[PDB]
Structure formats: structure tokens, C-alpha cells
Design a protein around this ligand. Structure first.
Ligand SMILES: Nc1ncnc2c1ncn2[C@@H]1O[C@H](COP(=O)(O)OP(=O)(O)NP(=O)(O)O)[C@@H](O)[C@H]1O
Ligand SMILES: Nc1ncnc2c1ncn2[C@@H]1O[C@H](COP(=O)(O)OP(=O)(O)NP(=O)(O)O)[C@@H](O)[C@H]1O
Ligand SMILES: [Mn+2]
Ligand SMILES: [Mn+2]
Ligand SMILES: [Mn+2]
Lengths: 704, 250
């Protein structure tokens, strides 16, 4: 042990008392009862560091503590007495900066009115849905506490081995058991560890660190991602670029942690090429940042020219500013966002010399990558600081850091090697050959018309929702739960899971077992997914309903859909679905651009549909005309022309929604279209005829 | 200041909206075909001596558009569900009308053109098989493109005017006096893409191989510069076209 590891692990385990009390074990306050749990655990196995770490649950004179510390002979671990007093005091203040029955569950950050069933974080099991408030059974905590105890018993007592097990088991546990408590315990634990280690490297036995700018909020954001990824000369290469940007990002974050002597707990988030880190405000740090910021940029310029930039900024922040008074954290994030906007208008300014594809082809059966030195054998790609050696199933990992994909379980990696869990939405349809499906094979798998389906989806006004977070630990929960929806559960949504949660969605075929879907990216609050056009059309409604359940119906998606000839270049498909996502956004948000559409340019006619509006229309008209799985209804086999005529009729409403001829031209099949609805004309809204093409055009595509 | 607006009236659709480097290139070419290099050399000298031309911008009827100064991006906080929505739509805007451009220079509130006088229609065609796209620029009624000239009239009459007629023979040319009211200031927007000499205040990089500062970028007393180079002797235009701009402190 050394103060740095101690204060980290300490901040992390300060509140491990909570799960033990809520199980019926030590008959004492969470504080004293958490002490009993680590001491008892330390005595079992025979690892005395746990009994050193036990001193965190019980804390504020301090006559007893000084002597209780003495009895645990510190020199044994290479520690001073005065060292442990500061570690304990730091972590005590740190707990209050991150910041009643005992059966109360975690209430959803998305909807504080609803709450999470107790479950362990597993992306292969059921989708987290905020539902009705149920008291958690005392058995469920006791079952948690025993696996929790059996895991800590076999873990290496390094924050990188402690974080994953605390995240597996304390993700869906209330940090405090009040009504409407929004904060995951795991997040409160990692943020106290983050804030504590920051105060240590701050130079604090001290309210000096609380009322003085001793912390840095460090925000990093890649600029030109959309260009770097979707402006090529093939789906394989597109996925390689996307994967390459994830490693380039990690290579920067891990560097920052390594050179500031910080732990992964200090990473508030790292989603969609956007990271935030709480760190020390020593002049040794700002220099250490300035060097990193500069060498990263200089490498990006040499590697891709002006295509991909990294905007890194930081801000002196005090303990006051992690908190509320009369909301300063938001205020501090706002001041920092401003710095990032300015830095993005000074792209590659950190160069003064500015004003005078075999390795990625190679990039299905790998477990992760080793962050080794740039000149190491087996290095398959390089970031601005380190080489990445693919860690394969039958093989040994190589490097100081192992990045491990879609587990919180180290598995068989060496004890010396730091575990970095990284989640990536990487679903793909397998071809006849073992490799990922081509745009061609995806398009060929379509019901009816052979077009490739493309959809870009994004959460509405997330920045606004995140701005409403009071504390580091609140933001940590919001950030992670959000990122996890896309990185974790979109695979499950695609597989056909959450059938009862999802329900009836617009659909053209029975959902396949191995759907003709390939994920390009799914992270932050957005996704880019391609596949057979009909499977893509349906997946949009599945993902929106999943997301409606996962939020408390309190947050919204907009989606842009596109159906292209399989020969259309990526840059054009990206551009069209982007244009259509922006349109959905710009016409109200909570809407979907289903299909390209003619309309009056009179500023009364939206191209987009409110999700519920389109879902209603499909429920109304599709069953009357469409049998399923590529087939019209029997009545309409010889009368397929009436569908085309309704579209030709809708065009004579587009020509002029005032010329009343479309009354003249008009059946017992579509009754609500024959009339001239007046509520619509009065409310200054379109005629029902305007909306129907949204359904018919999709059904005509399915039946060709 | 007042400037000559060179209005390009299009007789058909366009490929690019030409920027200052491409405009100077074209004019330099035409002048070589009319008067020989002797004249090209006198053109460069006039420009090096203080003459300037903007990049081309769209005009609609009797409305001139100008590039959104990057000066306002960090000022946009100068209904919370009106604030976020509208601020994102300004941040996308490439162009303001003259009136609103002049307001943006002084950091006073301004509004965006609702419709822009050109749509990009890129047309697909199948080849041999694959899909390729040729970007074309379609113009509304009495809409087109223009650039500004600052400098002596003798240089305009003798070089710019003749060159622009020659270049038309796809378009016809007409010119009118134009006034842009701009605050006096340490700081300025370029109405042209530039090869900067100093490092600039706010900017967008623009890759062509040369690295240009985009139209709308902000410099402090940066004239930019011209470059000569050999490849079978051609001059590359990268001079700034400055109008004074009020900056917010930050
Ligand atoms: N690895 C990735 N693969 C694909 N898309 C990604 C990846 N990481 C981030 N993205 C997405 O890229 C988009 C950001 O593109 P970017 O070009 O940086 O524009 P921006 O976020 O609007 N800001 P700006 O820096 O001004 O361009 C977001 O939708 C991210 O979710
Ligand atoms: N899970 C996440 N954790 C932290 N930051 C995130 C996360 N997802 C997205 N962001 C960031 O949140 C910011 C806002 O998201 P963005 O998609 O750009 O727009 P928005 O604020 O959601 N509004 P809009 O998409 O236009 O309706 C960006 O800087 C993203 O990088
Ligand atoms: Mn970005
Ligand atoms: Mn968003
Ligand atoms: Mn987004």
C-alpha cells in the first residue's frame, strides 16, 4: 500500500456499510457495520489491508481513532500514522462533496417518480425499466452482500479490480434511502474515490480544500468525428475507423490518468468521443496536461491532417462548486463548455508550424487490446501515446493496461496488468463466411425492394437534462445509465429481447433470429445502424419504445431513416440521414423521418412524424391492406392500384392544399380520407390525406 | 466602407460557389489570355499593394448575403427551450443578410435568413457498376452570386472588369456600389479565405496542398499573403479582406 492507493480504495469503500446494514448482519449503523464487514473479511483470507481500509466506515479530538490506527501498525504497509489521518479526513470531506427507511430502492434519474427493481448490472439479462415503487426484500441485499464478499475475497485490492465488482452489484442500489433518491451507490463510491485522490495530489490533515480552487474539471472532445468516419474513398473499414477512434480516445484518457497519478474512478464519463475527469489543480498537473494536449494534437495532425482534432480544456474548481447554494456545478460545467467551444474555433492552434489502411483493413474473435509502447512486437494500431496489441481468446495479454471488451470480469490476465473494462455496441449479421455482412448482403435480405436501411438516432435536449444535475455523483449516474442504453442494450433490442416492454411496433416481417442488422456506432445518446431496410424500419420503433421504458417516458429520441440503392456511397447515406435527423429535431423532436415525402412549402406541413402519430397511422391502415411477410391482403391483390391512386390523390393536395379537387376524386377501405376534416383546417394543420403516404409507401416497398 | 459588388448573373446552374483563391486564379488566367503575364504581374502588385477581392456569396433579388462572423459563436448568450433551439440554428447558419451581418459585427442581436437563395442538388449517375454524385447549385428567380472588390478604380477598370466579362463569354456580369457599415476595431473578419501570417483569433481550417482560414474567421491586423510556385509560375491568392468586428471578452 501507499497513501495514493489507500485514499483511492478508502474513498471507494467508505460507504460499503450501506449494503451490509440493509442486509440483517451486524446490528449497527452502516458506519460501524461496514467496519465489522471489512475487518471480518480481512480476518478471513488473511489480507490485513482490508482491516486498514475498515477504518473508513467509522470516522468523525479523535483520541480513539489515533490509538485504533496505532494498534494497526502502519509501518507494516509502508505508511506513517499522520499519513492515514489525512487519508481518513480527506475521504470524510470527499464523501460530502460527491453528495428514510432501508428497503427503499434506487429511484430513476430519468423519472424520480419511478424506481428500479434490484438487479445486478448484466446486459445479457432484462432491460432496466423504472416502474412502480417496491420496497427491496432484505434477502435480496443479503444475497448481494455474499457474492460481494466472495468477490472482494478473490480480488487484487487495486481500484481497477475493486471498481468492476462494486459496479456489477451496487449499480441498482440507492446511495441514500430517501424518497426520490436518484444516485447509484457505485457512482457515489467512484466519485468519492475520485474527489479524495484529487485532494491528496492537491497537497491537503485539513475548510481549505473546500473553499479554494484545488480541483480541475478536465473536459475532452474530438472534433470532426462525423468527417473522420463517414468520408471514405465498405462497412468493414467503417467499423474499423469507429473502433480506431474508441482506442485513440482511451489512449488519451489513460495517459491523463497515468501522468496525473489518478485512477479510472476519476473518469466521470468517456462516451461518443467526449470525456470528463476530476483531478488535482497543482502546477505539475496543468504542465502535464499541456504536454499531453500538445503531443496528442501534433500526432492527430501528422496522422489525418485537419480531419480529426481533439479539443482539451480544464478549469480551476473548488469543493463549493461540486455542490448547490440557493447550482454551481452546472455553472462550472457551463463555463468549461464555453472554453471547449472557443478551443474548437482554434483547431490545431497548439501547432505554430500550421501557418507557413492496411492496419485498419486487418482491424470477430478478440477479447480486447494491450496498451503497450509504440515499438512493441504485435502492435496492430497506434494512438498518440501507445501501441495496441490484440488480446485473442487462446493467447496471453501484453501491456501495463489491458482494455477488455463487454465484461466487468478480468478473466485470465496477469495480476500486474491494470483492467480497463470498455463497452462497445458491435452487433453485426455474420455472412455465410465468418466475416461481417456487406451493404450488398444486407440489402439482398430485404422484404420486397432491395435497398440498404440506414438510421441515425439521437436523444433530444440531453445537454439540458445533464445541466439539471446538482452533483458529480448525480452526473455520473445520468451519464453512465444513458451511455449504457446505447453501448449495452441496443444489441439486446436488435436480438429480439424486451418483447413485452416493446410491444406491437410497425413491422413488415416476423423478427429474424439472426437479424440482417450491422451497428456502425451506438454510444453517448445516439446511434448509426444499417441493415435490410424493413428490419431497419422496425428496429427504429423497437429502440424508441425500449428507450421510452428505460427513461420514465421522460426523455425522447428523434430518428432519421433512409432506404438507398446498396451502391450509394457511405458519405451520401450519412449526409441524407443526418439531414433527416436534423429535420425531425427541428420540427419538434420526439419525431421520426420515416420516408422521403412531397409537401406544401407553406410552413404548415412537417416531413417528420411524432412517434405516436405514425404508430397510430400504422395500427389504423396497415392491417386493412397488408397481410405480412412481403404480401398484400387477398382483396387488394387485383386492386393494388387503389393504393397508387390514393398517392396520386395526395399529390393534388401537395400541388395546392386549398384547391378542393381531392374531395371530387374520392371507398369503404379508407373512410377518414374521403371527408374534408375541419378541426384540421381550423387548428391550421394538415388534412389526414397528407399523412397516409408514410404507411402506403412503406407497404408498396414491402410488396415489390 | 463602400465596395464594388461584382454580380454574377447565372445563365444555367453552377458547380461551386467560388472562393477568393479560385476567383483570383480565374481572373489571373483570363488576364494572361488578354494582356499576357506583364498584366498578371501588375495585378499581383495592385493586390500586394492593398487591393482586395472577397469570396463569392449568394444574392437574392436585392438582398446581399455575407458570411456569419465566427465572432458570435461564443457570444450567443448575449425561454430556456427557445434559447437552446434557436442558438443551435444560428450555429449552423453560413450566411446573414447585410443588415444582420452589420449587427453581428457589433455583437447586437440579429436574425438569420429563413430560406437561402440556393439549394445544393447533387445528381447521381451509374458508372460502367457504382453511383457517383456531381454537386450542382440551382438558383432561385433573380438570385445568383457576387464578390466584393476594394482598391483603386483604375485597377478594377483595367484588370478585374475585363477579366470578369471574358470569364462570362455560363454567366453575365454587372456591378453596383455596396456599403458595409463596420465598427472600428483592433479585430476584423475576412470576407475571403486567407493564408494567415500571424496565428488568428477564431477560425475554421479549409484544406486544398494549402491550409486556408475560412471566410468568417477573425484575425488581429493580419494582411494574409500571396504565394508564387512552379509546376509547369502561378500565384495563389490568400490575402485577408478585413471588416472591423467587436469581440466579447473570454
Ligand atoms: N467511435 C465513433 N464512431 C462513430 N460515431 C461516433 C464515434 N464517437 C462519437 N461518434 C459520434 O460522432 C458525433 C460527433 O461528431 P462531430 O464531428 O464531433 O460533431 P459534434 O459532436 O456536432 N461537434 P463538433 O466538434 O463541432 O464537430 C456524435 O453523434 C457522436 O456520437
Ligand atoms: N452518455 C453521455 N454522457 C455524457 N455526455 C454525453 C453523453 N451522451 C452525449 N453526451 C454529450 O452531450 C452533449 C449534448 O448531446 P448532443 O447530441 O450533441 O445534443 P443534445 O444536447 O442532446 N441536443 P439535440 O441532440 O440537438 O436534441 C454532447 O457534448 C455529447 O457528447
Ligand atoms: Mn464532436
Ligand atoms: Mn442529443
Ligand atoms: Mn448526440
Amino acid at each position: 500500500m501507499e497513501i495514493d492507493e489507500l485514499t483511492a480504495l478508502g474513498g471507494l469503500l467508505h460507504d460499503i456499510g450501506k449494503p451490509v446494514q440493509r442486509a440483517g448482519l451486524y446490528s449497527g449503523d452502516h458506519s460501524t457495520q461496514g467496519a465489522r464487514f471489512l475487518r471480518d473479511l480481512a480476518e478471513n483470507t488473511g489480507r490485513a489491508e482490508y482491516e486498514l481500509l475498515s477504518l473508513f466506515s467509522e470516522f468523525h479530538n479523535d483520541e480513539l481513532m489515533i490509538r485504533r490506527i496505532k494498534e494497526l501498525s502502519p509501518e507494516r504497509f509502508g505508511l506513517t500514522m499522520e499519513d492515514v489521518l489525512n487519508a481518513l479526513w480527506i475521504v470524510y470531506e470527499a464523501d460530502n462533496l460527491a453528495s428514510p427507511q432501508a428497503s427503499r430502492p434506487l429511484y430513476s434519474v430519468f423519472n424520480p417518480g419511478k424506481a428500479y427493481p434490484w438487479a445486478e448490472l448484466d446486459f445479457e439479462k432484462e432491460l432496466p425499466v423504472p416502474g412502480d415503487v417496491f420496497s427491496i426484500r432484505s434477502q435480496d441485499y443479503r444475497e448481494l452482500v455474499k457474492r460481494l464478499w466472495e468477490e472482494l475475497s478473490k480480488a487484487k485490492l487495486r481500484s481497477d479490480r475493486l471498481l468492476p465488482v462494486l459496479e456489477k452489484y451496487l449499480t441498482f442500489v440507492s446511495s441514500v434511502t430517501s424518497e426520490g433518491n436518484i444516485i447509484s451507490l457505485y457512482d457515489h463510491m467512484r466519485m468519492t474515490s475520485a474527489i479524495a485522490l484529487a485532494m491528496l495530489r492537491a497537497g491537503c490533515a485539513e475548510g481549505r480544500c473546500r473553499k479554494e480552487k484545488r480541483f480541475l474539471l478536465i473536459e475532452g472532445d474530438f472534433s470532426g468525428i462525423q468527417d473522420f468516419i463517414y468520408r471514405v474513398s465498405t462497412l468493414k473499414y467503417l467499423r474499423a475507423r469507429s473502433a480506431y477512434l474508441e482506442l485513440i480516445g482511451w489512449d488519451v484518457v489513460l495517459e491523463i490518468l497515468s501522468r496525473l497519478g489518478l485512477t479510472r474512478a476519476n473518469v466521470v464519463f468517456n462516451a461518443g468521443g467526449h470525456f470528463m475527469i476530476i483531478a488535482q489543480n497543482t502546477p505539475d498537473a496543468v504542465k502535464e496536461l499541456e504536454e499531453i494536449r500538445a503531443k496528442a494534437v501534433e500526432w492527430l495532425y501528422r496522422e489525418f491532417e485537419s480531419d480529426l482534432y481533439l479539443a482539451i480544456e480544464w478549469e480551476p474548481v473548488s469543493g463549493r462548486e461540486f455542490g448547490r447554494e440557493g447550482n454551481l456545478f452546472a455553472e462550472a460545467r457551463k463555463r468549461l463548455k464555453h472554453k471547449l467551444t472557443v478551443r474548437k474555433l482554434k483547431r490545431f492552434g497548439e501547432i505554430k508550424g500550421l501557418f507557413e489502411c492496411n492496419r485498419l483493413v486487418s482491424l470477430p474473435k478478440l477479447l480486447g487490446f494491450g496498451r503497450t509502447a509504440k515499438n512493441d512486437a504485435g502492435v496492430l494500431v497506434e494512438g498518440p501515446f501507445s501501441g495496441f496489441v490484440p488480446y485473442l481468446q487462446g493467447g496471453r495479454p501484453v501491456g501495463e493496461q489491458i482494455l477488455v471488451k463487454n465484461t466487468l470480469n478480468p478473466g485470465e490476465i496477469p495480476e500486474s496488468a491494470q483492467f480497463v473494462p470498455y463497452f462497445v455496441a458491435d452487433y453485426f449479421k455474420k455472412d455465410p463466411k465468418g466475416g461481417v455482412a456487406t451493404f450488398e448482403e444486407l440489402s439482398m435480405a430485404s422484404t420486397g425492394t432491395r435497398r440498404l436501411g440506414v438510421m441515425k438516432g439521437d436523444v433530444d435536449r440531453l445537454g439540458e437534462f445533464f445541466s439539471s444535475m446538482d452533483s458529480p455523483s448525480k452526473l455520473a449516474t445520468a451519464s453512465r445509465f444513458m451511455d449504457y442504453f446505447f453501448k449495452g442494450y441496443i444489441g439486446a433490442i436488435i436480438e429480439g429481447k424486451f418483447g413485452y416492454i416493446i410491444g406491437d411496433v410497425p413491422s413488415l416481417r416476423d423478427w429474424p433470429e439472426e437479424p440482417d442488422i450491422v451497428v456502425v456506432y451506438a454510444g453517448g445518446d445516439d446511434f448509426f445502424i444499417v441493415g435490410a431496410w424493413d428490419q431497419i424500419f422496425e428496429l427504429a420503433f423497437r429502440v424508441r419504445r425500449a428507450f421510452n421504458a428505460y427513461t420514465g417516458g421522460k426523455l425522447t429520441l428523434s430518428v432519421g431513416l433512409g432506404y438507398f440503392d446498396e451502391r450509394t456511397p457511405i458519405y451520401r447515406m450519412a449526409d441524407v440521414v443526418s439531414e433527416r435527423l436534423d429535420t425531425a429535431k427541428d420540427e419538434g423532436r420526439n419525431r421520426v423521418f420515416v420516408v422521403g415525402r412531397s409537401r406544401p412549402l407553406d410552413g404548415k406541413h412537417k416531413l417528420s412524424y411524432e412517434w405516436n402519430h405514425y404508430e397510430e397511422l400504422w395500427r389504423t391502415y396497415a392491417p386493412r391492406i397488408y397481410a405480412g411477410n412481403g404480401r398484400l391482403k387477398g382483396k387488394l391483390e387485383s386492386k393494388k392500384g387503389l393504393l397508387w391512386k390514393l398517392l396520386e390523390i395526395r399529390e393534388l393536395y401537395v400541388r395546392d392544399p386549398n384547391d378542393v379537387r381531392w374531395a371530387y376524386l374520392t371507398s369503404d377501405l379508407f373512410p377518414e380520407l374521403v371527408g374534408i376534416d375541419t378541426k384540421a383546417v381550423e387548428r391550421k394543420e394538415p388534412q389526414p390525406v397528407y399523412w397516409v403516404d408514410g404507411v402506403l409507401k412503406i407497404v408498396l416497398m414491402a410488396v415489390r | 466602407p463602400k465596395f464594388i459588388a461584382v454580380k454574377l448573373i447565372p445563365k444555367g446552374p453552377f458547380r461551386d460557389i467560388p472562393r477568393a483563391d479560385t476567383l483570383f486564379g480565374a481572373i489571373g488566367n483570363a488576364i494572361s489570355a488578354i494582356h499576357g503575364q506583364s498584366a498578371v504581374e501588375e495585378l499581383v502588385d495592385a493586390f500586394v499593394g492593398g487591393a482586395r477581392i472577397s469570396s463569392a456569396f449568394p444574392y437574392s433579388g436585392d438582398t446581399y448575403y455575407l458570411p456569419k462572423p465566427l465572432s458570435v459563436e461564443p457570444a450567443l448568450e448575449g425561454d430556456e427551450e427557445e434559447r437552446y433551439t434557436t442558438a443551435k440554428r444560428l450555429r449552423k447558419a453560413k450566411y446573414l443578410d447585410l443588415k444582420n451581418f452589420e449587427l453581428a459585427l457589433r455583437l447586437r442581436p440579429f436574425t438569420i435568413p429563413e430560406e437561402i437563395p440556393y439549394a445544393r442538388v447533387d445528381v447521381p449517375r451509374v458508372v460502367l457498376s457504382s453511383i457517383y454524385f456531381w454537386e450542382e447549385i440551382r438558383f432561385r428567380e433573380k438570385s445568383g452570386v457576387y464578390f466584393l472588390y476594394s482598391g483603386p478604380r483604375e485597377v478594377f477598370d483595367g484588370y478585374i472588369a475585363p477579366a470578369m466579362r471574358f470569364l462570362g463569354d455560363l454567366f453575365e456580369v454587372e456591378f453596383h456600389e455596396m456599403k458595409i457599415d463596420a465598427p472600428g476595431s483592433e479585430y476584423s473578419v475576412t470576407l475571403s479565405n486567407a493564408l494567415p501570417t500571424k496565428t488568428p483569433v477564431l477560425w475554421r481550417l479549409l484544406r486544398k496542398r494549402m491550409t486556408f482560414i475560412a471566410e468568417g474567421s477573425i484575425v488581429k491586423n493580419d494582411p494574409g499573403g500571396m504565394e508564387r510556385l512552379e509546376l509547369g509560375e502561378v500565384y495563389v491568392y490568400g490575402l485577408t479582406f478585413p471588416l472591423g468586428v467587436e469581440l466579447p471578452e473570454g
